[PDB]
């Protein structure tokens, strides 16, 4: 009902705008539009109320406006603190909905140099093997941008069964890290000469290898 860009991006000090498009029964009806900011791991907080007004404590660089069936939020002088999710919200007469929330927008602050991932592959501990399980742990750290592909190999042959991989999220140094796991039975672990974790990032590839004979 309220459609937003799924992602907006920009360098520090730059200006960006987030769009909020509704129909004739909500924004087009002259109903107010409000905006919420949700920092990572926090509850949402009100950012803009009454199309354009700002609660106390909200920086001046945050601006709102409305035009016909759409509305838009404006951040001018993006800094690093503004990396968050933003939701517009209004009211729709037809749907009997006092509150209609927007689809949401992730805002990333693209002020950071490219950084190549560091890849670490751990084989199963003998402790876990004694528990009759075998998990290979591939840790990908210190990389930017945050898109990576991870591929696992057993003796140069792709393995897709039993892989779980986390979506990249930021480390304390504002770079990215991600992890992948390969879950094997002990018998599968020992039935191959090597296993590989292959991490692709911006065209470059890093391949770490482990072997049961180690």
């Amino acid at each position: 009902v309220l459609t937003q860009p799924p992602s907006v991006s920009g360098a520090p000090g730059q200006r960006v705008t987030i769009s909020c498009t509704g129909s004739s029964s909500n924004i087009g009806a002259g109903y107010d539009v409000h905006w919420y900011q949700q920092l990572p791991g926090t509850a949402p907080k009100l950012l803009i109320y009454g199309n354009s007004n700002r609660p106390s404590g909200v920086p001046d660089r945050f601006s709102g406006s409305k035009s016909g069936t759409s509305a838009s939020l404006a951040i001018t002088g993006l800094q690093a603190e503004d990396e968050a999710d933003y939701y517009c919200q209004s009211y729709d007469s037809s749907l009997s909905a006092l509150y209609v929330f927007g689809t949401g927008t992730k805002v990333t602050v693209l002020g950071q140099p490219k950084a190549a991932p560091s890849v670490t592959l751990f084989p199963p501990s003998s402790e876990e093997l004694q528990a009759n399980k075998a998990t290979l742990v591939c840790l990908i750290s210190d990389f930017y941008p945050g898109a990576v592909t991870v591929a696992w190999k057993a003796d140069s042959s792709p393995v897709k069964a039993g892989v779980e991989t986390t979506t990249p999220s930021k480390q304390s140094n504002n770079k990215y890290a991600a992890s992948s796991y390969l879950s094997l039975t002990p018998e599968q672990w020992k039935s191959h000469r090597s296993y590989s974790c292959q991490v692709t990032h911006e065209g470059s590839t890093v391949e770490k290898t482990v072997a049961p004979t180690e």
Partner: protein, 220 residues
């Protein structure tokens, strides 16, 4: 300070009942409406309903009408969200928020209550060493870690050397496996010089199962 205080995290199986609570604090509870907002993992905000504590006038979103009951006890400044029969897909963060009428925005938000709904039962983790070796060593710094396997529910926290080791630490988000159990890893980069002299212990805390595990991680 004006505050909406929400009850703690819940773990439930499908079919079970649940009532969670939101206590207004630092303002007259009857002078505002109180709404409930759902946020499922990785998705957006969904309005569930709103209630005026003064007269318990309740209005629900068309999607949640007949699916949940919102109520309020104005004598103790508390509003409630309840389910008679939880679904797995009710797994979510639920926010209490304070509404202003006519304008119909939310000026004050609670910190949220996490509700996990799964057929899994609470289970504490197995902790395995990710031992340093030449394979995790490069140029004087080496990586070591501990693998935190097969716990439920989420969260575990991990510290190193009871908090004394904080630089270089990264604890990753969890993986949810097909068993319904979670796994994660915590890693730290230390100097290679230290592997024979400095002891490294990870401290794995799983409050939902009342479990704490310390595991010293050594070179192979």
């Amino acid at each position: 300070e004006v505050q909406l205080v929400q009850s703690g995290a819940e773990v439930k199986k499908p079919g079970e009942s649940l009532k969670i609570s939101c206590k207004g604090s630092g303002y007259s509870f009857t002078s505002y409406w109180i709404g409930w907002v759902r946020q499922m993992p990785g998705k957006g905000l969904e309005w569930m309903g709103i209630i005026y504590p003064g007269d318990s006038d309740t209005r629900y979103s068309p999607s949640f009408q007949g699916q949940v009951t919102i109520s309020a006890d104005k004598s103790i400044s508390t509003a409630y969200l309840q389910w008679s029969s939880l679904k797995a897909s009710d797994t979510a963060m639920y926010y209490c928020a304070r509404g202003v009428a006519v304008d119909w925005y939310f000026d004050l938000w609670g910190r949220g209550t996490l509700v996990t709904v799964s057929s899994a039962s609470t289970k504490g983790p197995s902790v395995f060493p990710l031992a340093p070796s030449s394979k995790s060593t490069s140029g004087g710094t080496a990586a070591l870690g501990c693998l935190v396997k097969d716990y439920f529910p989420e969260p575990v926290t991990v510290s190193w050397n009871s908090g004394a080791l904080t630089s270089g630490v990264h604890t990753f988000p969890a993986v949810l496996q097909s068993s319904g159990l979670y796994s994660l890893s915590s890693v730290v980069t230390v100097p290679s010089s230290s592997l024979g002299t400095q002891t490294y212990i990870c401290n794995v805390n799983h409050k939902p199962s009342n479990t704490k595990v310390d595991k010293r991680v050594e070179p192979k």
